[PDB]
Amino acid sequence: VGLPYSELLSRFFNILR
């Protein structure tokens, strides 16, 4: 599924330098 992925993506975006 690409929505338990969506959350991950969001998290990644949040914690970028």
Place this chain on the structure above:
Amino acid sequence: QATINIGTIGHVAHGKSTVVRAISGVQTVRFKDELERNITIKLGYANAKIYKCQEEISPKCQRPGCPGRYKLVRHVSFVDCPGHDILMSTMLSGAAVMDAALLLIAGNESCPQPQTSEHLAAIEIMKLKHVIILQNKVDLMREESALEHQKSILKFIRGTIADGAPIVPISAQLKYNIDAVNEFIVKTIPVPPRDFMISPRLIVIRSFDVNKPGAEIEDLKGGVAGGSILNGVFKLGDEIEIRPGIVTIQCKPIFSNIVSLFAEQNDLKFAVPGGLIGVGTKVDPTLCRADRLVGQVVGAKGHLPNIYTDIEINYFLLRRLLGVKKQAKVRKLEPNEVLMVNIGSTATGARVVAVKADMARLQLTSPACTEINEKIALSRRIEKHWRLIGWATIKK
């Protein structure tokens, strides 16, 4: 030791090595001065740890809050092949050695990339649908663009034998989001069972001398074969026949008693299958010189694999080819033409004797060894370098 052979797949200059580094810390090296700047010939090796926080990369739970220490799950080893359409033989060899796959797609680079597609196809062919998909160069892409890319990928993966294979957005350089990947490694990839009594067979991909420049001969080392086991726990102190042989034109199999069976970073008593292993044998390090033990079969002494040149193949092909942008029509196989037949680890140059309905008879210019039925990926020369046409099984 190493519990499951997990392979890494992706496009050339995307960062498979980088990904490996991010995961493990163990470097694939990138070597021979050509490959220091550019791309490897040999497989890249790394040993990753799984000790889960249940109350991980290191066996201590000081980091994720709860001081209840990292609970041992597994130890996994990497099978990182070259993702170049010139050097595909190595990739093919890796494929019928692996138990599971790991896909790598870049953000800013396109979704129907040819090499990646080819790799995927190969994986599908050789029973490797356990693919964890990784979005790699996402530390470059927009909040919308990335999403679009993902959507496109999803669309692409609908008619493939991969159906709902998990996608993770990682940075291999910045070290983020790999927790999910780790979780999946236990979640989506269970290890397929590998027992005691299934006849012991070793598949060699690498030849190694540990003969260092500077030493004296009164302090010598034997030949080390870098190869994987997919059946039979090889224990210390056994005799071996390597069966594709040594060339005289006729070939004669090589006989070696076990010096060592080395896995992880420390030599062990045993070598439990589903892992890639460095096997010290009494054989000369002069035959383990550079890349001589590549695509050779090793059996425990008192065994009969057969060294075939004339082969009964059951073949199946595509409508339209891969390796190219320009996905060209599959024109029918032409008789007495040099194909490349990849069987487990071999990459033999073969000439077609006959073309039937679903069967083909092949002449081998270099002899390969069939113990079972043996899994085949086929390749052809249309556009200079070798493109992937289809797949086969030896009907024996």
